Amino acid sequence: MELLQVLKRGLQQVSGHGGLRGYLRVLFRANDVRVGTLVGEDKYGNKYYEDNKQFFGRHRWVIYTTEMNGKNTFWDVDGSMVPPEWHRWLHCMTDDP
Amino acid sequence: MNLMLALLTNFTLATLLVIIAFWLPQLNVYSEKTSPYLPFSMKFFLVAITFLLFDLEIALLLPLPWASQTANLNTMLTMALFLIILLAVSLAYEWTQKGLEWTE
Amino acid sequence: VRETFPEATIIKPAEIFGREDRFLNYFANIRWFGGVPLISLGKKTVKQPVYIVDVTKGIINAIKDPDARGKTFAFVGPSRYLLFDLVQYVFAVAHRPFLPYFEISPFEPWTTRDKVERIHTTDKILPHLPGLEDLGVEATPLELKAIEVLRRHRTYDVQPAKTIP
Amino acid sequence: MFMINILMLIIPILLAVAFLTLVERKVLGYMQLRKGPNVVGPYGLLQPIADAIKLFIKEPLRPATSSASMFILAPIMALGLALTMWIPLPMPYPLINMNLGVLFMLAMSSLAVYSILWSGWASNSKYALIGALRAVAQTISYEVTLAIILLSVLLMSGSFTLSTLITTQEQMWLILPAWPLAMMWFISTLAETNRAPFDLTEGESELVSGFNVEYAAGPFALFFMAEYANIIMMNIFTAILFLGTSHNPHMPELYTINFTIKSLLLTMSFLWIRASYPRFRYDQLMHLLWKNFLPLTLALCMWHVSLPILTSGIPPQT
Amino acid sequence: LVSNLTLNFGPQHPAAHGVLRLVMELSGEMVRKCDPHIGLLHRGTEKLIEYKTYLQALPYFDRLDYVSMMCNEQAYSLAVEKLLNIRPPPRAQWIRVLFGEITRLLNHIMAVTTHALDIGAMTPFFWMFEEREKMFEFYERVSGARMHAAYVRPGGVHQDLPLGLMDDIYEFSKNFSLRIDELEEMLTNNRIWRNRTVDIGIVTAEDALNYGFSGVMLRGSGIQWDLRKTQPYDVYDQVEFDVPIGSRGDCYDRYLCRVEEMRQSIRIISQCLNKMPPGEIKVDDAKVSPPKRAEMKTSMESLIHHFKLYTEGYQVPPGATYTAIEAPKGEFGVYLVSDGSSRPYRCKIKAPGFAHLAGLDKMSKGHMLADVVAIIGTQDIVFGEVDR
Amino acid sequence: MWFEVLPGIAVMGVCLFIPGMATARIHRFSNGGKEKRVAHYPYQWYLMERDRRVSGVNRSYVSKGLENID
Amino acid sequence: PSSRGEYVVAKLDDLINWARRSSLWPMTFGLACCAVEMMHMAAPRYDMDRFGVVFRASPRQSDVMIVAGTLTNKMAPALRKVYDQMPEPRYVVSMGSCANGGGYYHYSYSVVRGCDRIVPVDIYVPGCPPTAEALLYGILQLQKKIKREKRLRIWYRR
Amino acid sequence: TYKYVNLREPSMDMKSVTDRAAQTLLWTELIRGLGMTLSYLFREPATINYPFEKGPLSPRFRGEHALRRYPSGEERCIACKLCEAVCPAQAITIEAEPRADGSRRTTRYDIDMTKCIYCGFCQEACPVDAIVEGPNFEFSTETHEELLYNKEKLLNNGDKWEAEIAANIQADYLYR
């Protein structure tokens, strides 16, 4: 059974992102198609998901905005695009977002 | 005629990629570069000879599968076994007399 | 330039030779591969090449000297030579066969039409133009600084050319 | 129509070689506890393409080879032979049905040592040449075991025809009555293809300069491609010998799928082994052959000569 | 001398220990003479320290044996305390002993994994280096730097362990013993591993002592000697562990002394997570260890000391001393003179590798070339300490 | 997870599948949906030669039957 | 479809730049402590290999040199000798404080005060040592740099 | 205490010997090593998907140097030159003069970031929590000069990370 139950989670990760085109968009921007609680969002468009069932290090992640400070970051993200407030939570320096 | 063509295509294509990858990368003008700057070990030679002889004795055994189809098996089996037995002596003689030095 | 900048200095150098130059290397390479020396009348050309370092020192000394304003200088090697002699001298250093007697292309044109024209031209003799020694520089004989230029061309007792006094 | 068949056999090979590098770099990671290439394209599926483009456009070095004539022959030889080995293979239909297919494959692989010798014989280094010989002294040494072990099996098959090996295993795989051979035949394939733990060339690069170090980016992609082409062929050859799949003339594709799976599993085992053992010192990989494998290989050769006669298990000559 | 080879490690293979330019003489395949050239990483450490205050000089010691960071700091700290004639408080001595054995885990993981990397066994490198990471986080959370801590200092440590650290350290130790078994399952009994190590690099007990070998280069030769059990310094007279001993004194034994030691540390760490006492973590003497900030920002007598101790440093009585510790590689030790002022007059460092490397020529006599690879690794050489 | 290796394996598997599949179909296409004749020995090559003559169209894969008995 | 030469050329430049940036084969000069951090970037947690950065590449097959560690005078000549043997294009990454500017050992007699005295550097990763993740950012910084080159365009307009 | 790590004397009974013989002739031990690796192929790899994920740090982490401000806005540094006197690498250059209003403040404050060793002694010495090591660790540059911070480049980090520098000290200053 379990093997069948896995295929459910596979599909729930397509509805999780809201449609195939949503599925692909993350698949190529982030290479990971996990789905997690939207802990919040920032003014620049970054979205900080999370999942507490993942091993310590991968529970918390981000999806950078497709545009920042008037620059196209649809592909050209970098780790210096996280404002300081979130910067402390995303690095597990603290627990309260 | 096929195999004559097969080798030709298997090797003609090998030439292309060799020349394609040797010249066209040259036609990219990457400036230019200045000028950057044997002992005969016997053991090496032996293993060539050692394999050389053992390779000949193998040449005699290649027709074995056809041999087993003859009626004179008693002769076939003996001479079939005689060769392989000697091929062990050749190995034994070199081994026994300290002839496999390169193995060390 | 002279009309626009009456104080501007101007330098008239020979065909400079050096490690990355395109004068000595031009002979060594183009001829060798699939090519036979195409020297067009090599006995009617006189060349007096100069060292790249020697030219460089003058330019630096040109800046420093207050008297190099407006004047026109001419840098030339210590010795004139006949084109045929050098080409043999080159091949003599390069250790390559000598056989006296490549269109313009996209990318980088090698063996251009005009470049062949420019080699034929002879070195002007202009004693009225102040030379390197007027700056304190010393010219370097092509004999010394030819091996290091052509060393790479060589694969793994040799006489220099004949000057034209 | 035939030229189409050749191109539709050469081209798939080259693609498969490219994506074996992808699979290799990932299977290692998961055995090494890491993902491996999963960025370039989706799941790294474009990683090989970027490699091929990158290498070729890269500037090639100045070999300065004493012999330029041989410096080009070597890769031509290596890459041509690697492809030539695939024409007699039945899958289940050989491109060029050969009666002596086994000998054709056995003889061809022997020529391959020239590329390992011509290259080092033009590098112009007193060290690369020495390293080149050691590589040759290893290939030829193990080809002895290949032939004998290969020959012993044919006694239970009766002919040099490759497509006949399918018939011999109709009632069972050949791994069953010959597993002592398979153990050594497998290893003999590793050493012959110069793989870990027998990949001395790459491992001892610093101590003794490898033979291929002087070759540039472009050409190197040929030697490297040639090697990985052989690895697949040997495993395909292995599966054919010992894991033959029943052949249905009505639905050949079934055979191809199953035959492909067996070949793929064998190839992965080549990757599994690389990430499991240290490397053999040169003398020790010789001690293994002359003093451990060769005696046993001879003993089994007599045993397989005797066995069909005494048990009346002589296969048909045809 | 059939032919001499100047084997240089320019293309440094993934060793992370520096580059060694080795000059050899092969009589065919044997090695008739091996000559190491080392100075490539001589930075002048022993002369810079002349210009630094005793506090400013400490970070240099994280940069000698850069896989045994806190162990080095302990040696320098013990030397200075001994000169200063002061005793740290017990809680610090336990933290130092706690980490001194955590570092030993970091070091031995480096030695075995790389030593196994140079011989082609590559997979174990990744598995164990994932344990180093989690071990760095402990380094990270107590000092803030993943590798070079400067945590240990003359007179104790710098800061106390953050709350909840020891819960993690306990958690890490619980699972670790399985990790080693995942390793010994690869190399311990594997025939290929034994071939490359068995009866290789044999050193006699009598020669080792004369040639200055220390640490696992002794215990491999059956000698029973380990400074912890014989000249204990901090608390090592309060922990039960057994010193592994070799039998044949070859590479394989020294591979088993190290693997065995990595277990014996889990036996010590376990004890330090139970005997750790409450208290402060630096000598309660504000002329040597700077005072707490809160007291620095409130009390005059303390403010002065925070001033002088961070600009002029703390004087030290004139005198000389040689202090050594059982560092993971060998007997690390520093001979350190002091003229009375805040700057040491001289700091000789007895790097354990420097002695071992001299013995390289002795051990490689009558050995094939590829054994010189194994011999260098089994000595556990890092060229930060050798050249300094 | 480990299953993400499979696409690389599967894509390679196709590359290994084409050479076998192409040859099987190609032989059928030429030989009119029959396994390509195999002629290892002159007897076989002899029959495969006669069959061409009997075919009457210079093709050896056109196998005639009792309809040609006349 | 009518495609202007600049448009046709422009896209090619993006293709090759994608190839070079997507597949970097580094060479590591593990001269000193910063080498250890460089390993941790190959360790499982960061697994640089997945971006395309293979762990070990010979000098002649390399695309980027990583000068991780100090550079003493004695070791300087071999650094350049290795550099000059790199087939172009070749990018040099200076990692650590002792390679950016001679770091802790800046004033020592036997130290070269930065590799930039000896080779042209492209990226400077600061820290003693930079965290394994800090270096990984430095690599991902280079890839973007290789993505902004206009090799063809410049050629097209000569 | 001690213990022999290798002093075994294998029993020579036939069963014992046959085991060793069974081990050599069939590669049992080598197989057992293959088993271990085959298990790792079925475990979740420990790889974090950087940059979308970040390896965990702690509030004590030492990163880019930065200069703080009081809540009012005034500067915290008072040119006491203690940070300059202890920086082991001598990477801090301070030059101060009385300010136009009589205050004591710096005019030059350069932290050459290619001589810094990120020791952390600077912030340990500052008596007014002025110079602190932020938590930023991603500032690799494309030229050397960009790593020669001057006072203007340090404050901007202060006026850019104070939303986190302040939080960390609150989390950890008690241990100091």
Ligand SMILES: CCCCCCCCCCCCCCCCCC(=O)OC[C@H](COP(=O)(O)OCCN)OC(=O)CCCCCCCCCCCCCCCCC
């Ligand atoms: C009644 C009729 C009876 C007839 C039959 C009777 C005989 C049957 C029983 C005997 C069968 C013997 C099988 C022979 C295989 C070779 C085994 C062998 O002996 O190898 C020994 C070799 C070196 O010997 P060593 O371990 O060093 O011992 C010291 C000796 N002085 O050590 C080695 O082997 C080295 C191994 C190198 C390869 C290791 C890396 C690969 C291992 C993983 C692959 C495992 C095999 C996978 C099989 C794939 C099949 C497709």
Ligand code: SF4
């Ligand atoms: S930069 Fe840092 S890690 Fe690198 S050598 Fe210098 S002190 Fe060591």
Ligand code: SF4
């Ligand atoms: S971290 Fe240390 S070396 Fe760096 S600036 Fe601060 S005090 Fe100086």
Ligand code: SF4
């Ligand atoms: S940063 Fe702090 S220690 Fe340095 S001068 Fe300013 S106030 Fe003094």
